[PDB]
Amino acid sequence: SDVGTVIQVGDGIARAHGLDNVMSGELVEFANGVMGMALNLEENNVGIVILGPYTGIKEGDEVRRTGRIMEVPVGEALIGRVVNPLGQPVDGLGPVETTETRPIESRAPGVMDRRSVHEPLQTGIKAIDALVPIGRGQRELIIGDRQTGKTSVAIDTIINQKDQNMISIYVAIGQKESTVRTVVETLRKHGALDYTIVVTASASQPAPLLFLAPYAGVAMGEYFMYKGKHVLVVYDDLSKQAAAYRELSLLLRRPPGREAYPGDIFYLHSRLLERAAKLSDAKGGGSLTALPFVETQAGDISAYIPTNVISITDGQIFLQSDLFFSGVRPAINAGLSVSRVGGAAQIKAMKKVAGTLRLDLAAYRELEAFAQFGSDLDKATQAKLARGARTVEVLKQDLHQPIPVEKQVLIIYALTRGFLDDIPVEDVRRFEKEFYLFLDQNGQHLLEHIRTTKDLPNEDDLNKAIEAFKKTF
């Protein structure tokens, strides 16, 4: 009853007879040593999903139950490595020397085991850091079209965590191996590998590895979460995980759903994402911050998986192709973006200026449609349009160029207070550059005050510094 014979092999799945005592989700071993997961249990048939090259499995081959749920090895050794969902390294840097394992399917922390998220995860992107704040323990989705800046935003986030004790995990799923290798090397060049774990599930890998990759990543992250450390897990596309799970279900003869997606696909995402939590002091301050990714085809957020992931997350950053091609970088739709943590995940200095910035952008979005007549509009409308143009120039950033929080606060303060209404629009970026150097030359006290007290410094001194720089400019 612990041993069966496979009766059907095909297309990454198998069907076996006689695994009477197998559990749902258990692990099984084939005659060639390839692992498998017994997913579908039926009256006289067991559906096995193949976790390796299935070419070597033929009908009639022996299959043996292992009596063990999948466990991912985890430890402090994984930091700086690139592994697959099973935890085996994919680089040539030798084996990972861990000594403990965590179950891949584990319970999320309960309702009373958590705490209101209050400490900000400093992305380094001014638009996100101001208008779509993120805090440690949040589940924030980044959703957009292809080639808009999702992976770049995540990589910049991971880059910015150098001196923030902010351990990061990057689950690369569905990407071609060359893209993952480029991501790894560009993380290494900026020094992120000192605190980053990369989980790789490329396209050529069997679809169950794609399905399991975010589970393995969050399982690795939970180990550091439970020790009081702060963890960030980024899934570069949950869309491809959903596609792989739908493929598995269809092969396993499960009834289709909305778009042939399985009935429980929502469950599959939710029990993943809700594993990202901030814990209370009784369990330790350790938290986990999730950044799921979703790709929309015709900017259609109305599909099945995009709607599910939008429902799950605490906020959504919408990246738009038309914004990307119009020179707005990193093309964040601050009007359609949402954050249910909001000011709870911001510095007080950042809050005091981000509220006014949000008001300015809300006013500006009410006069875009009138810009067609913008040559001969009202004085107040013209002033609002000019402030919006200066704002959208201020929020523009370059690739792999994180900005410290204090300087973000200071530039947003300069923008909101009206010190930028005299300079020409096209110069704003140059301003945002030179002023920063000015700070590092003279405004070190202001930056130190912001970094220490986490609150805006004396406003008249800030105005005097701004006036001195404007004289310099």
Binding site: L41, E43, V111, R258, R340, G342, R358
Partner: protein
Amino acid sequence: RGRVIQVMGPVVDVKFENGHLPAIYNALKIQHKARNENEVDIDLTLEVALHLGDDTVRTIAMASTDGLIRGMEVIDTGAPISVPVGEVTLGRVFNVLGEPIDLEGDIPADARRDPIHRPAPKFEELATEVEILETGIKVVDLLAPYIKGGKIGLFGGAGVGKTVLIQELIHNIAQEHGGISVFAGVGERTREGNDLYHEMKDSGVISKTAMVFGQMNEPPGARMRVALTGLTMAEYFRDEQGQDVLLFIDNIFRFTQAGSEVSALLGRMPSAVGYQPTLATEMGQLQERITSTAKGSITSIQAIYVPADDYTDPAPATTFSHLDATTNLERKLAEMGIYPAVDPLASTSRALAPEIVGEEHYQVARKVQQTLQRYKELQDIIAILGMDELSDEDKLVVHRARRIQFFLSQNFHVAEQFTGQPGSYVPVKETVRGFKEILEGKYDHLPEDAFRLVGRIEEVVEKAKAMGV
């Protein structure tokens, strides 16, 4: 005793004796101790979904199905999911199964447990007695008043403010009307569930509320039965306690999607946008038990998420057919600081007529609606042309319209968590008095920012004094 024969994710097939099959919606228990080290302990609850014949039933799981072995016995409880009801229920947090997920002890075995599936009250057991329920929110109390026993829907997008508005309704009603409140966390976010529990506990509403959470990370059956669990608690409180009882539901959208996922897992053919064929039947079976009867009344406030601003989606459109009052939460107002971001013109109530609220209330509400509509029409002209181009009456209507527009926003008792400012409670009489005074031109000399976030028009005068006017 039956035995499990097929496991396909959250769907479990159980085979029974030749004639001793359980009924539909009956609760079954799988409690299995690991016989060896190769298996795991199992504590799972199933609900009989339908019958396949050959002494076999298809059931839906309310917990994780991982670790199930074909052949392990299943306990037939002979009744649907039972839920603790009454005094013991108050001040506690339960899951879909009625088990308290808090750390404040548990529920004794010898207590009254009600089934969560029951036919709705009959035609002659009903009672239509329209009476306004005062909530304390100016915009709601004026432009879309609620009624006792009614179903009030808060439609909105992603960050409009539905959950904070539910929190205020709970807090205000508990602190002023002293009513029993039940909260159903349908597809509840564990983060938002924790925040809700903490803010209930901090403000003392914990003793006037009983929270039911169906976690978002739970199988769809739990997420689509937790609403019925909360409804069962509310119905006990209505009947056996008599006084008005309120039932707040986290999101109806997540209950419809849980039902859709359950149907898809069961294998039924989808309808409309993939939804379950029996969507209307399930929503009716929920919303038809929320009625005022001869024994008492159940008021219900339900938040509805509208995906992509598609009001023609099956879930919101089907919800629209049960709601006496519908309040539309608009992101555009929220970005402007107007809270609760209630759309003044898209908010409709069954009881906005003189026969229910009085001639003065109806007249004031209609005048406010007309002024706001005229301002909306004049938006384009004031944006392109200057305010000088408008006539004197248009200038006056916009002048007053901005004052009303900000005045509908009020400081929130729960927003002290976000913005720190203490909140306020505004009686309906004082609400209509303030709006009438605004429409009468008594305060055209106060700058609009005075009306930004206050409770009473006297508070508007006080704030105008505070700014140094």
